[PDB]
Amino acid sequence: KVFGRCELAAAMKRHGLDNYRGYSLGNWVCAAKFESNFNTQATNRNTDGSTDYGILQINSRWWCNDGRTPGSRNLCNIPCSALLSSDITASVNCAKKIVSDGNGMNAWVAWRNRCKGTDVQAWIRGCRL
């Protein structure tokens, strides 16, 4: 499923990400724009044994089990397939999870390189939220 940016803002709002650990809603929308282009189904497979999965691109060495990743900790306690759903819950309880431990929103290399200085409130200007 690919979302609209306003329709993912509002879902994310609903799933209480607006200001969790101090990160404006607005960053969370940016992080998934530049991590998967709003596609619930995205995967990037790496040389390294691991795969980034879903809309916020959560890796398999650390966060989910997909039974094929080397040094696995499955710290979200979810199968990675759980994160390619069209529904974004399993991925938001997993980003909340990542963001506790040592969060930056830094965990996500697109938020660091493309959302970190900007006006991220720009990704929610115009939505009803």
Swiss-Prot record:
CDD domains noted in UniProt: LYZ_C (cd16897)
Subcellular location: Secreted
GO cellular component: cytoplasm; endoplasmic reticulum; extracellular space
Enzyme Commission code: 3.2.1.17
Classification via Pfam families: Lys
Oligomeric form and interacting partners: Monomer.
Miscellaneous comment: Lysozyme C is capable of both hydrolysis and transglycosylation; it also shows a slight esterase activity. It acts rapidly on both peptide-substituted and unsubstituted peptidoglycan, and slowly on chitin oligosaccharides.
Function noted in UniProt: Lysozymes have primarily a bacteriolytic function; those in tissues and body fluids are associated with the monocyte-macrophage system and enhance the activity of immunoagents. Has bacteriolytic activity against M.luteus.
Species in which this protein is naturally found: Gallus gallus (Chicken)
Name by which UniProt lists this protein: Lysozyme C
Residues annotated as catalytic: 35, 52
